[PDB]
A paper describes a structure:
The serotonin transporter (SERT) removes serotonin from synapses, recycling it into the pre-synaptic neuron and terminating signaling. SERT belongs to the family of neurotransmitter transporters known as neurotransmitter sodium symporters (NSSs) which also includes the dopamine, norepinephrine, GABA, and glycine transporters as well as numerous bacterial homologs. NSSs harbor a conserved 3D fold which consists of a 10 transmembrane (TM) core region arranged into two inverted-topological repeats, known as the LeuT fold, as well as one or two additional C-terminal TMs.
A density map of the SERT:15B8-Fab:IMI:VLZ complex was obtained at overall resolution of 3.65 Å with the highest local resolution extending to 2.9 Å in the core TMs near the drug binding sites. In the allosteric site, about 12 Å above the S1-bound IMI, the bulky backbone of VLZ adopts a nearly linear binding pose across the extracellular vestibule. The heteroaryl piperazine moiety of VLZ overlaps with S2-bound S-CIT and Lu AF60097, hindering the entry pathway to the S1 site and ensuring the blockade of IMI dissociation from SERT. In the allosteric site, Tyr495, Pro499, Ser559, Pro560, Pro561, and Tyr579 form extensive hydrophobic interactions with the indole on VLZ. The benzofuran ring extends close to the central site allowing the formamide group to interact with IMI (3.8 Å to the tertiary amine group) and with Gln332 in TM6a. The tertiary amine group of IMI interacts with the carboxylate of Asp98 and forms cation-π interaction with Tyr95 from TM1.
Residue numbers in the entry:
A (entry chain L): 21 to 130
B (entry chain H): 20 to 137
C (entry chain A): 77 to 617
Amino acid sequence: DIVLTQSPASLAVSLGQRATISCRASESVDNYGISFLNWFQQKPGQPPKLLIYAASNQGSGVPARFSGSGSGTYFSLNIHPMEEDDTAVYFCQQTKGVSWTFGGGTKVEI
Amino acid sequence: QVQLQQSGPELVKLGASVRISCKASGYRFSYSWMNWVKQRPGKGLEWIGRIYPGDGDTKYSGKFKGKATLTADKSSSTVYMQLSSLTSEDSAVYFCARSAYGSEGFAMDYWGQGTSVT
Amino acid sequence: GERETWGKKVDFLLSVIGYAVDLGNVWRFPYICYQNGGGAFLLPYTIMAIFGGIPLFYMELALGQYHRNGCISIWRKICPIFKGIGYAICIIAFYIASYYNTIMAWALYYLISSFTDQLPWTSCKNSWNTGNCTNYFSEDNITWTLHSTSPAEEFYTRHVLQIHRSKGLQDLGGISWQLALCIMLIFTVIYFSIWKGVKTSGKVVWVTATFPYIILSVLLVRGATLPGAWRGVLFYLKPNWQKLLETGVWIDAAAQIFFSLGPGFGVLLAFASYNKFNNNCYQDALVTSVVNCMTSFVSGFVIFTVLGYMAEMRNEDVSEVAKDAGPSLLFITYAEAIANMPASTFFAIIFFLMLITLGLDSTFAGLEGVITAVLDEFPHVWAKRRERFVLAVVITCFFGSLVTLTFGGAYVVKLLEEYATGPAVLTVALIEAVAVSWFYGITQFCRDVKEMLGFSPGWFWRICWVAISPLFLLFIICSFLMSPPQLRLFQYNYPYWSIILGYCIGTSSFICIPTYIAYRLIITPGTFKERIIKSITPETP
Ligand SMILES: N#Cc1ccc2[nH]cc(CCCCN3CCN(c4ccc5oc(C(N)=O)cc5c4)CC3)c2c1
Ligand SMILES: CN(C)CCCN1c2ccccc2CCc2ccccc21
């Protein structure tokens, strides 16, 4: 069981600014070079489509707006300035063993 | 292509048991995990357990090992999780996420429809 | 402060046969014995051994037993100008203890990571990619792809080596702490085995050198019991006389027999320099070679009965089954076969135990050689405190081996394996043999052996040391002195500057010989003729 602290839990960002979402943990989840962590997005009434592999590599069928950076303990999701279509909840699901854990989610809106 | 399917919704009864199914197709499912999450209405996701059809390696977290025993049927391309002692808190949706290959960081690529129990 | 003799005669007879079989006889002999015919290789193995490895072995033993003066200080009694052989063999021992303990570190990691009831070679977990996984034969379906890799291969190249985090020799940053603290234990065992000289380095052999055989017996039994043993043993013993025509089989056989018997590396001298004078230096130099050959033969049976079982299970002939280098051939396919065996978690523990024990005593001997050499070279600043300078040589070898334990790992280990054992070591051995044979008159080298044993050497060794060994060493030198080095491990083509690096590593040796030759010719006075004639004859005070 790893603790996944997220902040800020709510981003009141408008159209045209680069919002940020932090995700810290005790580990040090960097394992075998590929930092075991992911980023999701749960639109209201939808399954959590995946965003980022290993907090750096893009997912599948996703625009290049959702970037990714960080290694070790501090993982950040520096989303490109977006419009009101990407209003959802973003989770930070690590994958380092043995029991994975989901974040708290940071809902974004104008 | 990869796509997953689940069963329909059920009813939450005090102490009853329910068997949530989850199909798989379009890939060699005998080597990819089949996660399970619980997204309660209004709150964030919560990891339930894990399974690996082909070796029987299952993991859990926070007493979910005695409340949800996962079972993988590698014949009909389906995975199960026999819930038990359904407390009023267990009335939520139950996705069936497919963990990707290990080199990608165990990415939950494809998700089922969601077997909500109420 | 006399020469500390061995505990018993068997105390040295076992130490030398522990030093003999290190890793060639356990993985390289079958891998080099199936590529070259299979049955047409044992004949160019035996008729090359008897001609170029056993006479050198007996010459080293007789020299060390008569002179009793080590490796670097024996040249002041053989040929003064060739005293650089000691410094050259010390540099060689440094490079080789640098690249050689990494394999033992990998084996110890496999040992300490095999205590789990389910070995981590059957499943396919996080650090082991699944997109190219599944090539393990324990599957009913016939799904296969040329890109798929077995889980044991991913365990060897992604968990212990972490070679996926290194694009080659261009960058190898990051050190494997789990291996950095794993090789430290092995070097601690080495120092605590050779921290007293021979009184403990002989007693450790009583359990380190005979234990690999006790494990090889049961492994051979289990392999012969396997369902599909004969399908592999037949291929191991199938002769292809059309392969014997090419000189490649002869070159490989000569290289294998030389680097398996290991004559002239400054260790057999240091060993024979300890036992008594009247000891039988013939009945122990003639049994060690045949014991090494029989060990290689039995280990070939083991490896190839396992490979035959694996091929029979994978529904495919023995070809196209783990065609790669030696360490891969022992850590991937054999590891998978062990993980699929019925009584798993036991045929892995004992296998890695034997794999580390038949390397520990070998490294003990390889370091004790140069230790005794440098000790009896300077008996005033040394030979009074042997507790020290062994810590020094161990820390030196460890700090030199700290580059082979990075995430690059095999990318440097293969280089130091196929460059530090090239024409440098063979030129050192050739110069040693031509100094003991041509310069130092073999008439005296027969008179002393006769007065030591009780009978002069027969006409077999009398003609070989002067015509066969210095010729079969010149041949083995000029063989791959022109062959293009094309290392290419793990589908990684080495850059061109790697060739210059290997040339410089080879030049690190065989530079001490001309250096000391010049340094000795300048000091002696007179014209060139007397300057030569002075430092050819032994001191003899
Ligand atoms: N300087 C220089 C220089 C110049 C020009 C060159 N062209 C090519 C080279 C080097 C190419 C590799 C040469 N090999 C290959 C294999 N090989 C060997 C075979 C059997 C064995 O068995 C064992 C064991 N049991 O340890 C060990 C062991 C080792 C020893 C040497 C080279 C180098
Ligand atoms: C080749 N087996 C049989 C000898 C033992 C290992 N030995 C080796 C190993 C490979 C090549 C040459 C040498 C020379 C002897 C030496 C000296 C110091 C440390 C290791 C080694």
